[PDB]
Amino acid sequence: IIVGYGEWPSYCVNRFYTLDTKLWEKSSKGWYWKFPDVLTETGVFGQNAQFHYLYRSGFCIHVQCNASKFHQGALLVAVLPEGADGFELQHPYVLDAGIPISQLTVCPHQWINLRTNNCATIIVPYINALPFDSALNHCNFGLLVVPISPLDYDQGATPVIPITITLAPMCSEFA
Amino acid sequence: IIVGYGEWPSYCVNRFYTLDTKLWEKSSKGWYWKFPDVLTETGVFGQNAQFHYLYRSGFCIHVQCNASKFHQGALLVAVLPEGADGFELQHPYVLDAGIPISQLTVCPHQWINLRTNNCATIIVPYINALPFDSALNHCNFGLLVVPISPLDYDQGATPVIPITITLAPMCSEFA
Amino acid sequence: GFPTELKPGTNQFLTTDDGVSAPILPNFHPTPCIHIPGEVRNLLELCQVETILEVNNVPTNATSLMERLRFPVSAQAGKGELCAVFRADPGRNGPWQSTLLGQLCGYYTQWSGSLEVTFMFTGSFMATGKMLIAYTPPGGPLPKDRATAMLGTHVIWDFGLQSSVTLVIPWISNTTTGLVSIWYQTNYVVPIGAPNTAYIIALAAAQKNFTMKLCKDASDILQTG
Amino acid sequence: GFPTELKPGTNQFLTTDDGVSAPILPNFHPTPCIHIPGEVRNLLELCQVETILEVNNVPTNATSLMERLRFPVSAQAGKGELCAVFRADPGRNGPWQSTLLGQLCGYYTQWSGSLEVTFMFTGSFMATGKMLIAYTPPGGPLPKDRATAMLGTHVIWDFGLQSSVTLVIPWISNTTTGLVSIWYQTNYVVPIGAPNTAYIIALAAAQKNFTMKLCKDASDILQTG
Amino acid sequence: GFPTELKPGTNQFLTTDDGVSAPILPNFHPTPCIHIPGEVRNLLELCQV
Amino acid sequence: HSTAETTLDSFFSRAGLVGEIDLPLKGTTNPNGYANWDIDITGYAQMRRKVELFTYMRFDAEFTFVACTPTGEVVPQLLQYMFVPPGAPKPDSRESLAWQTATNPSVFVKLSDPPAQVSVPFMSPASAYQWFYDGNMMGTFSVRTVGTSKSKYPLVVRIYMRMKHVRAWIPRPMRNQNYLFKANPNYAGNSIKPTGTSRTAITTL
Amino acid sequence: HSTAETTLDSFFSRAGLVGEIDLPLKGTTNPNGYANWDIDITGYAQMRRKVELFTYMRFDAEFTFVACTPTGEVVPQLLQYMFVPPGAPKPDSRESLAWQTATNPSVFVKLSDPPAQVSVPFMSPASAYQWFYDGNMMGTFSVRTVGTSKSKYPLVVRIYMRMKHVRAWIPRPMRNQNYLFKANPNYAGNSIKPTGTSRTAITTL
């Protein structure tokens, strides 16, 4: 378990939200999600996001995939400060921002190597230059899942590997 | 009882002086009196005002009105530093001095709402940049009585409401 | 001699500086200071004094300028009807520009804190009725009717029991804004022989946690002569 | 008056100087500082974080730039064959120029300390084989074959038992260099139904005794607009 | 050297000022002062006559 | 410093341009080389409305004299800048004997110097200055160019003033209407304006 | 001092040339004798990539004003150099009333002096400046030559800035591609370059 920047969420919708399943192929580039934009439409959190004026919350993110022992590949999961089906990266080498992907391990990160493990867990505290902001006008961070070493298998196996994201809000305020 | 600026009169004609009755109508603007100019002609105080060279005195002012339970209106009574029948305001919105009436509550003041009360009392200490001045060449303050909400009644009731001012000199010197 | 070296800020005149200069009249003795009542030493003492809020800033003629200080309540207007609205911004143009809080914050740039608004009913003793004063936080719009405004921060104010109500507005800040609206709960009830129309006077001030910063002598309209 | 004499360094402006100048806004109060996570206060904290070492800096097309981050291991290549070589210089042009250590030492002139390189095998669970990672000190050439590289500082790395090996490079210094080479000990063994080719990802950082000195804002290629 | 910065009142001559200037005759010794009767040291002594 | 900017020390705290006198080489503005200037604090155009929030005040003053050519050029000239206290006579010409009376303090300064700077204390016979009297002399600065002949350069002298040790009593409502005179609260009664702006209806934002 | 040069105090520690304004005697560059300059820290060409290693920063600034003739000559001229805080209006002409508002601090200085030098504090409404906002005004220096007429000399004014009391949070990857705009992370997607240099084969030194 990775606790981001050595700090736990703290005070200044307590359930699991399994989002949807992505499909990882031999020609995937990568995906990203923006928080809290991913969750302002579903459930009780989506009501309190757009009915209140101020917002403060931390998170806990689980990333999992399941495959056989005849598949190979590696993913890099990272969290970088500043819908619910994600967007796809066009230029994953420059992370669509002009910054290299080979230095993305300066962030809270975790590897998924299919040879070794199949789950990643990152805990994110609340980060802002203000104590309270708006959930609908400001996104705090983004989640990146990029295949560094590509997927491979022999012909006859399952060509598509599931990736499921599940998350839990932790120490939320609304005012 | 309002004690002006949190301070009582003190040393460095002890009777009540009921002045006269004003008549408040549906078209009144307001009235003002200048002290000690209002009292340099009546009684023992009017003799010692114009026979001595130096002067120092505080006051206590009572403002009363009497009406029935079928009348309505409100008056603002205030004291602003720097005859016996008063003058009438021509432009009560600018207080005949170019200053707004809506900020006159920064002074020692008291409201008279006919729905609630019928008497106001303000105690005024001696205020000067000198310890002694002349009663005949320098007026210390003025008393303002302005109707903010106008008088109203139904036809058949008494169209005119009395307003009586009564005052008492307090800790006077003459030299 | 003592060695010095004269840094690059020497022969300059900065107008916001503070030093000790030469007194031209030494051994002159000024007049001693007597006690005068009413000494002010901070401007936040003056922001806490209630002054009249001109909610009714409609008339513009010179013979109707005193009508800006009061707003009517009549007996010919039904229940559930809106009476008046105003924003909760002391530094902008509008109703708050007649208060002393709105004039002192025109000499600054940034402010934040809590407010308070007092309403005073000046009708006759024999009249009754109820009102609904509501407050909407920044971001939400004006309510459409009396029923949705009741689902929120509000107060019911009865005329026959109480002549004054107060409303503590929470934190305003940052140089949108909140909204205050007055609705009619019931109608205006009156006996025979009493008038049909009354007026309400609004008074506004600030709380003890109000602050201002970054002074600015703003170019006023008030020009000399 | 107090006698002074004004030494020859007086009316000059040195751009690397440090003094106290006049604040133009006295008695203005800035915003207090809240707690924000992730505070950095020395740049040697950032040199100790592992980033990806682009050993495979061959392709140059835009649609093959992600192939620079991994280098292959296949089943059609025999034993005793060389796989890859690279130098051990973080400040020069080459593979180290993609790491964060190689970018921060482009702002300085002199550095010295120890390094560490981590290799990660990303093949399938069913594949086995062995490798030979060797290190040659500064001055000696590249070895001619697997047998002479074994007579030296090396490690045997087995795929079937361990997915990651590390190599502590001793002291590099002084703004020739050492060499790291990867050889094939055995062949690449795989069952039926598993792929024949895998990839290795290299990660590089610095130890706790690494230092840098004599700052230099080197004229980067990265030009503004 | 000691850093100074020369405020805007430097090279001026104010005629009501009071400082210490250079004595042109050092180690010269003036005549000592004998007792003389009738010493005045305030002008309010003379207003009372 | 947590509300140390709303104090009356900070509310009256900067040097503002009050007074600007011109000594031309030809013309009819000041034909000789001298000028008189009576000390008022309301030569800065934002200052009269600020001090008239109160009734009584008490302060010290600090004056600064910067001078130059109309283009901005610095030339080698020597000036006098004397202070006439209240109750003392003022100069009539350049050959007046008031320029060399020792009870009027002077500051001789070259034009290629830092600006001259002096301090003036509280000089009223009462205990405070009052801005409203129902029923305030600080002095005079005279400015001359030193010489027996006329100078060779046109000069402009600007005067800056910072108040200090400020105390105040009895707050008043602020000024609502435009001014017409000095030390006189008169206003234009045939054109009276509201305090702020207006709108169309009381139920419309 | 045994790794006291890699601290963030030393990494942001020198005065660099940011901003250079020109007051010509004839032309169309600045036809009157004034110019406005908005405070940005990325006028020094090596500075934007350095501060964008982090997400949040907090610092003070210190400014220095050196001025001369295009040849390099020193002439007797007087200048103004006033500071307009954020939220205050800026001058429109030479006869604007913003040049003599007392809440905009000025520094009157001669051209034959050491360079003027002032300090500006942290002035954001938040707790830090942020260089990336998914969803930073310091002020303005106005520079004028003092006078009612136009000056007789062409002048160039250069501005230097040193940052101090630096704190920083949340490191990020450094910039890889060339910039195209300001406060905008856009890049040329039709020409993407590698981070470093290349070679022919992986087995050749």
Short mmCIF file of C-alpha atoms in Angstrom, two decimals, chain C residues 6-16 109-110 174 213-218, chain G residues 85-88 101-109 113-117 123 125:
data_model
loop_
_atom_site.label_atom_id
_atom_site.label_comp_id
_atom_site.label_asym_id
_atom_site.label_seq_id
_atom_site.Cartn_x
_atom_site.Cartn_y
_atom_site.Cartn_z
CA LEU C 6 27.42 52.82 0.34
CA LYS C 7 24.99 50.14 -1.00
CA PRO C 8 22.85 50.81 -4.13
CA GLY C 9 19.86 52.29 -2.26
CA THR C 10 21.38 55.58 -1.06
CA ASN C 11 20.25 58.87 -2.60
CA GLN C 12 16.61 57.95 -3.19
CA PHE C 13 13.29 59.21 -1.86
CA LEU C 14 10.67 56.51 -1.25
CA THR C 15 7.33 58.05 -0.31
CA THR C 16 6.23 55.14 1.93
CA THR C 109 -9.19 46.25 -1.67
CA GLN C 110 -9.83 42.94 0.15
CA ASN C 174 -13.25 38.33 -1.82
CA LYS C 213 -6.42 44.92 3.92
CA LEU C 214 -4.43 46.41 1.01
CA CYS C 215 -5.32 50.10 1.37
CA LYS C 216 -6.23 52.10 -1.73
CA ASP C 217 -7.13 55.79 -1.87
CA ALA C 218 -9.76 55.19 -4.53
CA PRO G 85 -0.42 47.15 -6.49
CA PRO G 86 -2.81 44.54 -7.93
CA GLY G 87 -6.33 45.92 -7.98
CA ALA G 88 -5.37 49.56 -8.56
CA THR G 101 -1.96 58.97 -5.71
CA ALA G 102 -0.34 58.39 -2.32
CA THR G 103 -1.24 54.69 -2.11
CA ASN G 104 0.99 53.96 -5.12
CA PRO G 105 4.54 54.17 -3.70
CA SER G 106 7.20 55.98 -5.74
CA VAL G 107 11.00 56.27 -5.65
CA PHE G 108 12.34 59.62 -6.88
CA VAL G 109 16.00 59.21 -7.87
CA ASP G 113 23.15 57.86 -8.37
CA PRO G 114 23.56 54.23 -7.40
CA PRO G 115 20.68 52.10 -8.71
CA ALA G 116 17.41 52.22 -6.81
CA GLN G 117 16.39 49.10 -4.93
CA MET G 123 0.80 39.31 -2.38
CA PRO G 125 -4.93 35.83 -1.96
#
